[PDB]
Each structure stands twice: as C-alpha cells, then as structure tokens.
Amino acid sequence: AEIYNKDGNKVDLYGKAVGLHYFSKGGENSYGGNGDMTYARLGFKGETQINSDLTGYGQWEYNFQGNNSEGADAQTGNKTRLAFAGLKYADVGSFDYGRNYGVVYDALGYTDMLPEFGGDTAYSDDFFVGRVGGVATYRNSNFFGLVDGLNFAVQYLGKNERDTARRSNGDGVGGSISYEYEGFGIVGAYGAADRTNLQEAQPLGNGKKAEQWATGLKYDANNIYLAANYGETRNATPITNKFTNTSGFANKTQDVLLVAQYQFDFGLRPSIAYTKSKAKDVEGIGDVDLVNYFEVGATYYFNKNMSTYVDYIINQIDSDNKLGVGSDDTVAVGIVYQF
Amino acid sequence: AEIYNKDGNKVDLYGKAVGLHYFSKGGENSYGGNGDMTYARLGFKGETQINSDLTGYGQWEYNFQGNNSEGADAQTGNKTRLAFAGLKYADVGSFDYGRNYGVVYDALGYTDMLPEFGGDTAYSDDFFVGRVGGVATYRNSNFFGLVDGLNFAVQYLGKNERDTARRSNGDGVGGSISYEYEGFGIVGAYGAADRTNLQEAQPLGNGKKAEQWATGLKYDANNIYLAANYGETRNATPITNKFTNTSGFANKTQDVLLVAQYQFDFGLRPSIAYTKSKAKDVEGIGDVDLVNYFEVGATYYFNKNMSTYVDYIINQIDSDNKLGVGSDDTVAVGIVYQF
Amino acid sequence: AEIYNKDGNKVDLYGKAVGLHYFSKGGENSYGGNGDMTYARLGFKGETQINSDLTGYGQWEYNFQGNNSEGADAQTGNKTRLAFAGLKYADVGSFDYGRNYGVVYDALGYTDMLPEFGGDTAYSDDFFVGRVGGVATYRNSNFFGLVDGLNFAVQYLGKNERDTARRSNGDGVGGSISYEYEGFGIVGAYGAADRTNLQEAQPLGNGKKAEQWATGLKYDANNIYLAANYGETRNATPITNKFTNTSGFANKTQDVLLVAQYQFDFGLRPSIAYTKSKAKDVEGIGDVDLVNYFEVGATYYFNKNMSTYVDYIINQIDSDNKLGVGSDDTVAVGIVYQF
C-alpha cells in the first residue's frame, strides 16, 4: 500500500498474513509436508524521482513464519527475501545491487504462477535460479528505447563462502534475453559460476564450474495464462540422499515446467500444471527423479486484498525413489490477506 | 495508527516502545526477575470491505526484545505473537486461521488487565489458554443477529509436534459461550486435546488427554472494572521442578483470578489484584502452589499514546516451595510510547 | 517518512536498503573484510503532544542483514539497535529509558560522520561509548532555557549480566557537558561502571572498575565539517588476541579521531579522516595498536533519499601486530535508498 507520496519520493509499505495448512498422509515422506504452514510477509518498495531522467529505488522484504512457537524455535524459517538499492537512467537502463533474484529466474518466473507450490527449480541461495545475496544486475528495457518489447539483462554474482555448501557460491556471470509481442513472450537465460572449496569436497556433484540455463514461452492476454520452461544444470541443483544423510549437487538436471490458468471476471483463477525434474549421473545411483507431479488448484480473488485457495499436488514420484524424495500427495488450503 | 484508507481497504500499522525495568532482590529466585526488560512491538491490522455483507481481515504482531545485546544473543525472546487471516459474513459470523489466542483466553482475558503482570494462566503455546499456532476459529456475535449480547465461538487446534514438549500439542477442539448485559459480562470456556508422544514420555503429567476450562464474571462500565476467573486443567499446565531440572505438566490445577481497577478522568488507573494457582497430584510432590500473589499497581495515561506505570507484586509463595517457584517480590516500572 | 500526523501524535516510519560490497585482498586479515555487506534498516520515531509543556516520545530501530542466506544462518547480524520511550517537560529537560546510546557517544558522535567506517571507538554493548541496553538518560537543553547553546546530560546504566563478557556490564553512572557557539561545538563526556564477575575472570583486563572519557571539538557551518576527538579508557575497550583465541579488555587506551569533510551544492560530500587507537599495558604484550588508518572517501547525494558512496581505508596497522589486528586496506562501495 502506498503510504507516502511527497516531494518526489513515494514509499509503499506492503505485507501479507497467510493462514495456510498442508494436508498429507504421514508429512514426513510427502511432497509439501503436513501441519500448520502459516506465515506473514512485510516489506517496502521505495521510489524517488531525483530528476527528469534519473530515478532511485530500494526494496526490502522479510518473511516471518507464523508456525513456530514463542519459545526456543521462534526464528526457524524467518529471513530476508529481498534487500537491494538501485538507479535507473532514462532509457540507458537500470543497475541495482543487493539480495535479489538471479538472472535465470527471468526465465523460470514464467511457470512460477501456482497458488502455493510450483517453481520448484527456482531454488533460493542457488546461483542464478532464485534469490541470492550479492548480485550486481544491469537491466535494459526496449533496447535503449529503440526496439519495443525487447529486454536484456546482465548479472554479476559475487562469491558467498557460507558455512554450508548448500548456500555457498563462487564468482559468476549470467544474463537473459527476452522479447514480448502482442500477448506472447519468449525468454532465454544462462549463467555460470565457480563452485567453492566446500562445494567441491561434497560427495555428490563433480566439477569446478556450475551452470544453469532455461528458456521461456508464454501466452498472457485475454484472461488466459499458458507457460512453458525447459532447463538444464551442471553442478548446480542441490540434492540430498535421504538414505545416507548425504548432500551436495546433481551433475546434470533436465527440468520441464508447464502451466495453464484462467481468470474469470467473478474472481476464480483455476490452475493446471505439469512439473518434472530429472537428475543424471548421480554418483552411486545414476538417474534420479527429484520433482514429478501434476497440479490441480484454484484461487478465489474476493478482491486485490482478499483471497482463498486450494492447491492439490498429484505426486508422480514413486515409492522406490533412489534418493528418498517423498512420493505422497500434498494438499494446501490457504486464506490470504494482503495490502 | 490508521495509515491507509483507500478503495474499501484500511490498514493500521501499530507498535510500541516500552522502557521497562524490573526490581527484585537477588531476580534468580523471584517472581518476575531483575534487570532490564525493555521491549518493542510492531504489527498490522488489515481490513477490507469485499462487498456489502462480506469482509476480509488479517493481522500480524511481532515482539522485539530491547534487552538483548547486538552480539550472539540478539534474538532471544523475539517472536511472532499473532499471524492470522480471516473472513466475516454479515451476521453468519467469522472464520479465521493462523496463530491466534486459544478459545479459553475468551474467559481468562477477563483478568488479564494488569499493567505488566497478571494473566498467569494464559500460557502461550499451551493448547487453548493463550496464543497458539494453527487454530481454526469460528466466532458468532449476537447469535446470528437475533439475541443481543450473546456470543459463542468454536476453535479447532491442529497438532503441533515441536522439538520440546512444552510447546507441542495434538489435535483438539474447544469453545466458548459468553453473554454481556448492561455493563455485566459472563463467560464460559472449555477445550480438550491429544497430548503428543513427547508429552507422554515426560516425568511430570500423566495421561493422553489434556483439558482446560474457565468461567468469567465482570463488571465493566462507569469507570469501574471488576473481574473474576475460576479454572481447572487436566494434563495441560506446564510445570518445572527446579530442584531436579525436571519438566512436564501438572495433572490438576485450580486457578483463581480476581481484579479490581478504576479509571480517573485525569488519567490514573490504579489496580488491585489477587491471583492463586494450585497444582494437584504432582508426582513425587503432591500439592504444589505455582502462582500466589497480591498485586498493587497503577498506570498513568497522559493520553492514548503515552503512559507510565508501577506494578508491585506481593508474592505469597513461601521459601520452601516444593518445585522451586521463586518466592520473592518483584516490582516493575515502565514507560510506554504506543501508536 | 512522516506517515501519520493526527490528534497531537505524529509517527515517522523510516528505513533504508543499502547495497554494499567490501573489496579487500584475502578479508580474513583486513580492516573491514571482503564480500557482500548488504543490509536493510527499519524503525519508527513516534512523538505525541500530551499538553502545552509536556511531550512523549518513543523510538525503535532494527537491523536486518541482506548478506545472509535463507537457510540456517538467516539471523546472523540481525538486531535491535534502539528501543526507548521517554518524556520531555518544557525546559526542565527530558528523561528516557531503554536501549540507547551511552553518554560518551555524545562526544564520539563528533567524528562518526564517515560514509561507511569511522567511529571505531563507539563500540556497541560497551558501557558508555555506543549503544547499550538499560540506560536511564536525563538530558537538558540550554540549561533550563537560561544559557543558549549549553547542554548537559546524565545517564544511569543498569547492570547487564550476559552470557559473554564482551556484552556484559555492571551498574554505572556517566554524563556529558556540551556547548555550541556560532558554528563551533565543544563537548566533554565521562562515565564509570562495575565490571561483572565474568569480566574479571578474563585473561585480558585487570580491575573492578571500567572508565571511559572523551572530549569533542568541531566546526559545523558554511558547508565545512571538521571534528576532533581524544579519549582514554580503563578496563573498558574490548580486545582479542587472534594468536591464542584470547579475549577480554584493554587496561588503557588512548584514542585519537580527526575528520574533515565538505558539502558541495551539487551533491558531493568528500571525506578525509585520521583514526588512531593505542592500547597500553596488555598482559603478555605491552603496547598494541588496535586501530590505525587514514581514510579517503566520498558520498554523492542525488537527494535526501538517494545516494552512492566510496570509502577507502589506508590501513596503517603493520604486518607484525601483536594481537593480530588485520593490517590490510579495505574499500567499500555503496548504494543507498532511504526514506
């Protein structure tokens, strides 16, 4: 909600309270888990008009979990999602730095439209696919104001030597090219980076270089939203062997994401989605499936502030999965107030 | 403070900074402790008018402690208090889900009017008495718009298998009936729930079923506030044996709460209160008193935003208490700014 | 940003997103470190006019780090900076209590004007020099409205027995006298306090009494800012022996701080600074230098909301420093949006 608009500076303080339960037989060995998954969000988007052609902006977004106790475990799952400041000059584009989405999310965001789940490949703190800390991102709209609908972007990821290999990364470069024409939208994205010492010393994942690329195709006009994503990764996707407490990365993944949705004028947005992600050359296993499901779901928009939703995952993963990826269905019911 | 009111949606961003010190001889073995107890609060209440009869709402409330360092211990006592979203339809009532107060607090809230302390039985993360995560709560005002002042409510608590027994719970149902007539107010509340495996395996507290009930009686008009609460609990109230580092639950408790207050037009709200809570059938002890005090205190309201207060506990607990409950007096002095 | 101003109460919700990287050869053994140092800030200043002569106020300020992951380490460096409520009566002055700056910062704040670094002696959770929890602070402007530009202040620090000696303190008193005349400003500040048991049992630092004093001199008008600080400390400044994993306090320190800055109408604020801090009588060492550098830096103010800055530390510390204080240079580049 815009709560300040004075003297060439507007601030938007926004947030949401999401009442959210997950139903699954077991959670312990299912897709999403079982129990209370209530959370709250808070953030600000700030925007200042320095002059006629120059513009400043900043954003911060925090996640508070509503499913912890007030005791010892009160912070589990609480985190900053976004924290970046940036400048935008006329048609020369924009530069920002901080915690933000990796460039490959420029692609993957295409299918990340599900009411609760979806966008399984957009892992956070995972190089270029999701949110990451320490990214320089240049972005260009309409090719310096000369070619309508053509957008490109470049991103520089500074190394993050963290205490765990899962959240660590080295120096890297990535980028994306995208074009949008009369409802349609085509996107390509790629990025490569160094693996840290701690990532190399991991039982799963072999190499010194991590890669992630993904294409995007979508129709998004006249109340219809269709979208497709294909992606591959070298030494990038994080994997866990639940049979041995082993973790690391998958040498190769192929990732398919399909999404179909519709928006009725009265408020209903039903959702059908397909998602499959296979991992190749997993040491002491071979070929494992990590994500495999059909999705049926809906979202009722009472208005721009209030909504409820059901999201049903038909989990195609089988009972004898090599890595121990939960094979059971998960259903999520939600009530959202946002501002 | 209402900081947004546009297009059938109002947001209220509120919070408070509370400068608060506790004085006690020792803290280590007193009622409230000794030292700095400064804290800050922040939250939002959001409310949207979807249509003539339908209404959406959300709330989130966070607690930041102002008595930690900026070093390692910076998060101790920081937590989400409330996080829930909900709908309200004309006179059919309202449903909300998330982190909220258990239904039995509908009763206990009657005596929870002390400037600092009081409401000792309204334990948080303790089934139905205080705040809990994962509660479905239906609420009805004036019996579907037909019987003025008569309110009932039902609550469904989903299981919380936490890492500690103190904060855990199983599936349960609870409810409350309440009636308010010309200043007066009568309330009854009850709730039962499964104890988790980890709660069963505890040295203190025997059973598979936890119960909590409490009645309420109050006068609240013409500047006078009087209130009374009686409650009992099976396998619900958490207890600790400070002589052996044992914890668990008390098989039975009887809980008495009395409160008398007055509000002078110039700002002063003095407070007298009585509170006693005895535990029965404590294994290897028998009958222990957990809470036992008289309370004298006051609160000066400079206005709706500014206040100061003294709260003096005359701790009736004795020096030879079986469980080690601190027997010393505690005094709390406070300065509050709120918005 | 002022987001509420109704009925004798104004609220100012403010914050900043700071994109910030540090460049150093190694970080491991440099002044500021190397890598992403992105952070975000959020806080409120609240102010109410109770009556013609009486005024209430409150403040809370939180620090969110933007350089952590969303995993296990998500809270590292997150903390409350300020949390205090207070009253101000006409010319009789003001009293506040909570987490706030120690009185000696009244002095040291003189040189704490650097774009990123500087103010090295204003350690937080360190008695009277920086931010601390549990301080009663009386403050007087213009000597009860009788002597223009003459300000004094007294502060009472309640003991903080924390889990670490670094963040702990005992009971203490401190104060400051300050005078400001036609651009110029002179300040003196002093404070003494008990060391806790845990501080006494530390290998470094000998005594039962900790002291901190500092003078201030500044010119601050006509776009020029010059400032000087001299300080000494008994048993107050925290030190670490990186050669043995020893920590504690320095028996004596002498602290020099010099700062020169200018503000061009078009937005540029260049900065030159000198900072030296020597420790005397360090057990098993003798005389060690803790902080020793020249500073060159600038800050571009696009406006009151947007800015960028470079801060270059020329680290005069040598390679054979006895305590292991990093001797390498550190450069910090920043992009700030604030509101």
Short mmCIF file of N, CA and C in Angstrom, two decimals, chain A residues 1-4 13-23 26 34-42 62 64-76 78 300-308 333-339, chain B residues 3-4 6-11 13 42 44-50 54-60 62 64 75-81 83-87 95-99 124-125 131 133-135 158-160 162-164 167:
data_model
loop_
_atom_site.label_atom_id
_atom_site.label_comp_id
_atom_site.label_asym_id
_atom_site.label_seq_id
_atom_site.Cartn_x
_atom_site.Cartn_y
_atom_site.Cartn_z
N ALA A 1 0.85 -1.22 0.00
CA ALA A 1 0.00 0.00 0.00
C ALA A 1 0.87 1.25 0.00
N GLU A 2 0.56 2.17 -0.90
CA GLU A 2 1.25 3.46 -0.96
C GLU A 2 0.84 4.30 0.24
N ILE A 3 1.80 4.55 1.13
CA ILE A 3 1.54 5.22 2.41
C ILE A 3 2.27 6.55 2.52
N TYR A 4 3.00 6.91 1.47
CA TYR A 4 3.74 8.16 1.40
C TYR A 4 3.98 8.53 -0.06
N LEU A 13 4.65 0.62 1.72
CA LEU A 13 4.77 -0.42 2.75
C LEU A 13 3.71 -1.48 2.50
N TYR A 14 4.16 -2.70 2.26
CA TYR A 14 3.26 -3.78 1.93
C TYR A 14 3.56 -4.99 2.81
N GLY A 15 2.61 -5.91 2.86
CA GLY A 15 2.78 -7.17 3.57
C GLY A 15 1.57 -8.06 3.43
N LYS A 16 1.70 -9.29 3.92
CA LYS A 16 0.57 -10.22 3.93
C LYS A 16 0.60 -11.20 5.08
N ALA A 17 -0.60 -11.51 5.58
CA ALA A 17 -0.81 -12.57 6.55
C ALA A 17 -1.48 -13.73 5.83
N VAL A 18 -0.82 -14.88 5.83
CA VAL A 18 -1.32 -16.05 5.12
C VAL A 18 -1.59 -17.20 6.08
N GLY A 19 -2.87 -17.49 6.28
CA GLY A 19 -3.30 -18.66 7.03
C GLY A 19 -3.23 -19.83 6.08
N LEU A 20 -2.43 -20.83 6.43
CA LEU A 20 -2.07 -21.88 5.50
C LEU A 20 -1.82 -23.21 6.21
N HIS A 21 -2.62 -24.21 5.86
CA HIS A 21 -2.44 -25.57 6.36
C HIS A 21 -2.11 -26.50 5.20
N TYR A 22 -1.28 -27.50 5.47
CA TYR A 22 -0.96 -28.55 4.50
C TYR A 22 -1.55 -29.88 4.98
N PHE A 23 -2.27 -30.57 4.09
CA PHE A 23 -2.78 -31.91 4.39
C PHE A 23 -2.03 -32.97 3.59
N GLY A 26 0.80 -39.07 6.71
CA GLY A 26 2.11 -39.35 7.29
C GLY A 26 2.45 -38.56 8.54
N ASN A 34 3.07 -31.89 6.23
CA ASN A 34 1.76 -31.87 6.89
C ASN A 34 1.79 -31.01 8.15
N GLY A 35 0.75 -30.21 8.34
CA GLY A 35 0.64 -29.38 9.54
C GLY A 35 0.41 -27.91 9.22
N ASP A 36 0.64 -27.06 10.21
CA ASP A 36 0.48 -25.63 10.04
C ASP A 36 1.66 -25.05 9.26
N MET A 37 1.35 -24.25 8.24
CA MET A 37 2.37 -23.59 7.42
C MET A 37 2.11 -22.09 7.31
N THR A 38 1.38 -21.56 8.30
CA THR A 38 1.06 -20.13 8.40
C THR A 38 2.34 -19.29 8.36
N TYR A 39 2.29 -18.19 7.61
CA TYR A 39 3.39 -17.24 7.59
C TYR A 39 2.87 -15.82 7.39
N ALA A 40 3.75 -14.84 7.63
CA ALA A 40 3.47 -13.44 7.37
C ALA A 40 4.61 -12.78 6.59
N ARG A 41 4.27 -11.77 5.79
CA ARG A 41 5.25 -11.02 5.00
C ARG A 41 5.19 -9.52 5.28
N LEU A 42 6.34 -8.87 5.19
CA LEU A 42 6.43 -7.43 5.37
C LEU A 42 7.58 -6.91 4.51
N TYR A 62 10.77 -9.15 4.10
CA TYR A 62 11.05 -10.11 5.14
C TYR A 62 9.97 -11.16 5.25
N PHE A 64 8.29 -13.71 7.94
CA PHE A 64 8.06 -14.17 9.30
C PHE A 64 7.18 -15.41 9.24
N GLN A 65 7.65 -16.49 9.87
CA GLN A 65 6.84 -17.71 9.98
C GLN A 65 5.82 -17.59 11.11
N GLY A 66 4.58 -17.98 10.83
CA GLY A 66 3.52 -17.99 11.84
C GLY A 66 3.27 -19.38 12.40
N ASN A 67 4.17 -20.32 12.11
CA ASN A 67 4.01 -21.71 12.56
C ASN A 67 5.10 -22.20 13.53
N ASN A 68 5.81 -21.25 14.13
CA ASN A 68 6.75 -21.54 15.20
C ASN A 68 6.12 -21.24 16.57
N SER A 69 6.79 -21.67 17.64
CA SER A 69 6.33 -21.33 18.98
C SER A 69 6.93 -19.98 19.37
N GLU A 70 6.58 -19.50 20.56
CA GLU A 70 7.20 -18.31 21.12
C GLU A 70 8.43 -18.66 21.95
N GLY A 71 8.74 -19.95 22.03
CA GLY A 71 9.89 -20.45 22.78
C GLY A 71 11.18 -20.40 21.98
N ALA A 72 11.97 -21.47 22.11
CA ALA A 72 13.33 -21.55 21.55
C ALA A 72 13.40 -21.49 20.02
N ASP A 73 12.39 -22.05 19.36
CA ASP A 73 12.38 -22.26 17.91
C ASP A 73 11.74 -21.11 17.12
N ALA A 74 11.63 -19.95 17.76
CA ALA A 74 10.82 -18.84 17.25
C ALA A 74 11.30 -18.21 15.93
N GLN A 75 12.55 -18.44 15.56
CA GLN A 75 13.12 -17.85 14.35
C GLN A 75 13.20 -18.77 13.13
N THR A 76 13.02 -20.07 13.32
CA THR A 76 13.10 -21.04 12.22
C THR A 76 12.27 -20.58 11.02
N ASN A 78 12.44 -17.73 9.44
CA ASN A 78 12.44 -16.27 9.29
C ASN A 78 13.68 -15.82 8.55
N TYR A 300 -9.48 -18.05 -5.32
CA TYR A 300 -10.60 -17.13 -5.41
C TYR A 300 -10.17 -15.74 -4.97
N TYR A 301 -10.29 -14.78 -5.88
CA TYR A 301 -10.00 -13.39 -5.57
C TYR A 301 -11.27 -12.63 -5.21
N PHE A 302 -11.51 -12.49 -3.91
CA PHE A 302 -12.59 -11.63 -3.41
C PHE A 302 -12.35 -10.19 -3.87
N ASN A 303 -11.09 -9.76 -3.78
CA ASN A 303 -10.58 -8.55 -4.41
C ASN A 303 -9.05 -8.55 -4.39
N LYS A 304 -8.43 -7.41 -4.69
CA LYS A 304 -6.97 -7.28 -4.71
C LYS A 304 -6.32 -7.45 -3.33
N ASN A 305 -7.14 -7.47 -2.28
CA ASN A 305 -6.66 -7.61 -0.90
C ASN A 305 -6.97 -8.95 -0.26
N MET A 306 -8.08 -9.57 -0.66
CA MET A 306 -8.51 -10.82 -0.02
C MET A 306 -8.68 -11.98 -0.99
N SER A 307 -8.30 -13.17 -0.53
CA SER A 307 -8.35 -14.38 -1.33
C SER A 307 -8.30 -15.66 -0.50
N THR A 308 -8.78 -16.75 -1.10
CA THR A 308 -8.62 -18.10 -0.56
C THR A 308 -8.21 -19.01 -1.70
N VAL A 333 -4.39 -25.66 1.76
CA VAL A 333 -5.52 -24.73 1.81
C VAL A 333 -5.07 -23.44 2.45
N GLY A 334 -5.47 -22.32 1.85
CA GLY A 334 -4.98 -21.02 2.27
C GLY A 334 -6.01 -19.93 2.37
N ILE A 335 -5.76 -19.01 3.30
CA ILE A 335 -6.51 -17.78 3.41
C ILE A 335 -5.52 -16.61 3.53
N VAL A 336 -5.59 -15.70 2.57
CA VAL A 336 -4.62 -14.62 2.46
C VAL A 336 -5.28 -13.26 2.61
N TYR A 337 -4.79 -12.47 3.56
CA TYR A 337 -4.99 -11.04 3.49
C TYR A 337 -3.67 -10.37 3.12
N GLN A 338 -3.72 -9.47 2.15
CA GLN A 338 -2.54 -8.73 1.74
C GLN A 338 -2.88 -7.26 1.54
N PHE A 339 -1.87 -6.41 1.66
CA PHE A 339 -2.03 -4.97 1.45
C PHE A 339 -0.82 -4.38 0.72
N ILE B 3 -2.98 4.22 8.72
CA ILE B 3 -2.03 4.86 7.81
C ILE B 3 -2.43 4.69 6.34
N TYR B 4 -3.56 4.02 6.12
CA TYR B 4 -4.09 3.79 4.78
C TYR B 4 -5.59 3.53 4.87
N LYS B 6 -8.08 3.58 1.63
CA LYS B 6 -8.50 3.81 0.25
C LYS B 6 -9.18 2.58 -0.34
N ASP B 7 -10.15 2.82 -1.22
CA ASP B 7 -10.78 1.78 -2.06
C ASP B 7 -11.17 0.51 -1.30
N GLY B 8 -12.01 0.68 -0.28
CA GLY B 8 -12.51 -0.44 0.51
C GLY B 8 -11.43 -1.30 1.14
N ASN B 9 -10.34 -0.66 1.58
CA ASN B 9 -9.28 -1.33 2.34
C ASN B 9 -8.59 -0.38 3.30
N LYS B 10 -8.67 -0.68 4.59
CA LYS B 10 -7.92 0.08 5.57
C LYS B 10 -6.85 -0.76 6.24
N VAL B 11 -5.68 -0.15 6.39
CA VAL B 11 -4.54 -0.76 7.05
C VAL B 11 -4.24 0.07 8.28
N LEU B 13 -1.08 0.23 10.79
CA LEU B 13 0.25 -0.15 11.27
C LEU B 13 0.43 0.42 12.67
N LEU B 42 5.56 -4.40 17.08
CA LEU B 42 5.20 -3.93 15.74
C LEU B 42 4.19 -4.90 15.15
N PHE B 44 0.51 -5.17 12.14
CA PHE B 44 -0.52 -4.58 11.31
C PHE B 44 -1.87 -5.27 11.45
N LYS B 45 -2.92 -4.45 11.44
CA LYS B 45 -4.28 -4.93 11.34
C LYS B 45 -4.79 -4.42 10.00
N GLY B 46 -5.20 -5.34 9.14
CA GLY B 46 -5.71 -5.00 7.82
C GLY B 46 -7.16 -5.42 7.68
N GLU B 47 -7.96 -4.58 7.03
CA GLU B 47 -9.40 -4.79 6.94
C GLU B 47 -9.96 -4.28 5.61
N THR B 48 -10.58 -5.19 4.86
CA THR B 48 -11.10 -4.89 3.53
C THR B 48 -12.61 -5.19 3.42
N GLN B 49 -13.34 -4.29 2.77
CA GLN B 49 -14.76 -4.48 2.54
C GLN B 49 -14.99 -5.04 1.14
N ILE B 50 -14.99 -6.37 1.03
CA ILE B 50 -15.16 -7.06 -0.26
C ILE B 50 -16.49 -6.69 -0.92
N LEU B 54 -19.86 -9.05 3.04
CA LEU B 54 -18.62 -9.82 3.19
C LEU B 54 -17.42 -8.94 3.53
N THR B 55 -16.57 -9.42 4.44
CA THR B 55 -15.42 -8.65 4.92
C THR B 55 -14.19 -9.54 5.13
N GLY B 56 -13.04 -9.07 4.66
CA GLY B 56 -11.77 -9.74 4.88
C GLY B 56 -10.92 -9.03 5.91
N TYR B 57 -10.11 -9.79 6.63
CA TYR B 57 -9.19 -9.22 7.61
C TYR B 57 -7.94 -10.07 7.81
N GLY B 58 -6.87 -9.40 8.22
CA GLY B 58 -5.62 -10.05 8.55
C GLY B 58 -4.92 -9.31 9.67
N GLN B 59 -4.11 -10.05 10.43
CA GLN B 59 -3.32 -9.45 11.49
C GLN B 59 -2.01 -10.18 11.72
N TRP B 60 -0.96 -9.39 11.93
CA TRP B 60 0.34 -9.90 12.34
C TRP B 60 0.95 -9.00 13.42
N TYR B 62 4.54 -8.71 15.98
CA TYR B 62 5.85 -9.21 16.34
C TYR B 62 6.36 -8.58 17.62
N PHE B 64 9.82 -7.64 19.53
CA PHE B 64 11.26 -7.43 19.54
C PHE B 64 11.69 -7.09 20.96
N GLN B 75 18.55 -12.40 19.32
CA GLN B 75 17.19 -12.84 19.01
C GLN B 75 16.38 -13.40 20.19
N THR B 76 17.04 -13.70 21.31
CA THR B 76 16.36 -14.25 22.49
C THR B 76 15.10 -13.46 22.82
N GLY B 77 13.96 -14.14 22.79
CA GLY B 77 12.69 -13.54 23.16
C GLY B 77 11.98 -12.81 22.04
N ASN B 78 12.59 -12.76 20.86
CA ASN B 78 11.92 -12.24 19.66
C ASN B 78 11.04 -13.32 19.04
N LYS B 79 9.82 -12.93 18.65
CA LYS B 79 8.82 -13.88 18.19
C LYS B 79 7.61 -13.23 17.55
N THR B 80 6.91 -14.00 16.72
CA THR B 80 5.59 -13.64 16.24
C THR B 80 4.58 -13.98 17.33
N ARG B 81 3.75 -13.00 17.68
CA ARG B 81 2.68 -13.23 18.64
C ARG B 81 1.43 -13.65 17.90
N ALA B 83 -0.50 -14.07 13.88
CA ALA B 83 -0.44 -14.12 12.42
C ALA B 83 -1.62 -14.91 11.87
N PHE B 84 -2.70 -14.21 11.52
CA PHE B 84 -3.91 -14.86 11.05
C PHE B 84 -4.66 -14.04 9.99
N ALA B 85 -5.30 -14.74 9.07
CA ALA B 85 -6.17 -14.13 8.07
C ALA B 85 -7.56 -14.73 8.20
N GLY B 86 -8.59 -13.94 7.88
CA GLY B 86 -9.97 -14.36 8.10
C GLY B 86 -11.06 -13.64 7.33
N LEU B 87 -12.25 -14.24 7.34
CA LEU B 87 -13.41 -13.71 6.63
C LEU B 87 -14.59 -13.55 7.58
N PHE B 95 -14.74 -16.56 10.39
CA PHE B 95 -13.78 -17.64 10.47
C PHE B 95 -12.41 -17.05 10.21
N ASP B 96 -11.45 -17.43 11.04
CA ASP B 96 -10.05 -17.12 10.77
C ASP B 96 -9.13 -18.28 11.14
N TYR B 97 -7.95 -18.30 10.54
CA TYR B 97 -6.98 -19.35 10.79
C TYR B 97 -5.58 -18.76 10.86
N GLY B 98 -4.74 -19.35 11.71
CA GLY B 98 -3.35 -18.94 11.84
C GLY B 98 -2.89 -19.00 13.27
N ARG B 99 -1.89 -18.19 13.61
CA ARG B 99 -1.52 -18.04 15.01
C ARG B 99 -2.43 -17.02 15.68
N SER B 124 1.28 -19.03 26.68
CA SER B 124 1.37 -19.11 25.23
C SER B 124 1.98 -20.46 24.82
N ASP B 125 1.56 -20.95 23.64
CA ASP B 125 1.86 -22.30 23.16
C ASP B 125 1.50 -23.37 24.20
N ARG B 131 -1.89 -17.77 23.30
CA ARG B 131 -1.61 -17.78 21.87
C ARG B 131 -1.09 -19.15 21.45
N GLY B 133 -0.22 -21.60 17.59
CA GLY B 133 -0.13 -21.65 16.14
C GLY B 133 -1.01 -22.75 15.60
N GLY B 134 -1.81 -22.43 14.58
CA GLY B 134 -2.61 -23.43 13.87
C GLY B 134 -4.00 -23.66 14.43
N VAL B 135 -4.76 -22.57 14.62
CA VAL B 135 -6.12 -22.67 15.15
C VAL B 135 -7.18 -22.16 14.18
N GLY B 158 -5.07 -27.68 15.35
CA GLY B 158 -4.27 -28.70 14.68
C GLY B 158 -3.04 -29.03 15.50
N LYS B 159 -2.59 -30.28 15.42
CA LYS B 159 -1.43 -30.73 16.19
C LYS B 159 -0.17 -29.95 15.86
N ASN B 160 0.66 -29.75 16.88
CA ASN B 160 1.97 -29.13 16.74
C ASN B 160 3.03 -30.02 17.37
N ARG B 162 6.38 -30.24 18.11
CA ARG B 162 7.58 -29.41 18.21
C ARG B 162 8.74 -30.18 18.82
N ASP B 163 9.92 -29.56 18.88
CA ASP B 163 11.13 -30.21 19.38
C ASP B 163 11.14 -30.32 20.90
N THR B 164 10.28 -29.54 21.55
CA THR B 164 10.13 -29.57 23.00
C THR B 164 8.67 -29.89 23.36
N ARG B 167 6.09 -26.83 24.14
CA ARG B 167 5.47 -26.06 23.06
C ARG B 167 4.63 -26.92 22.09
#
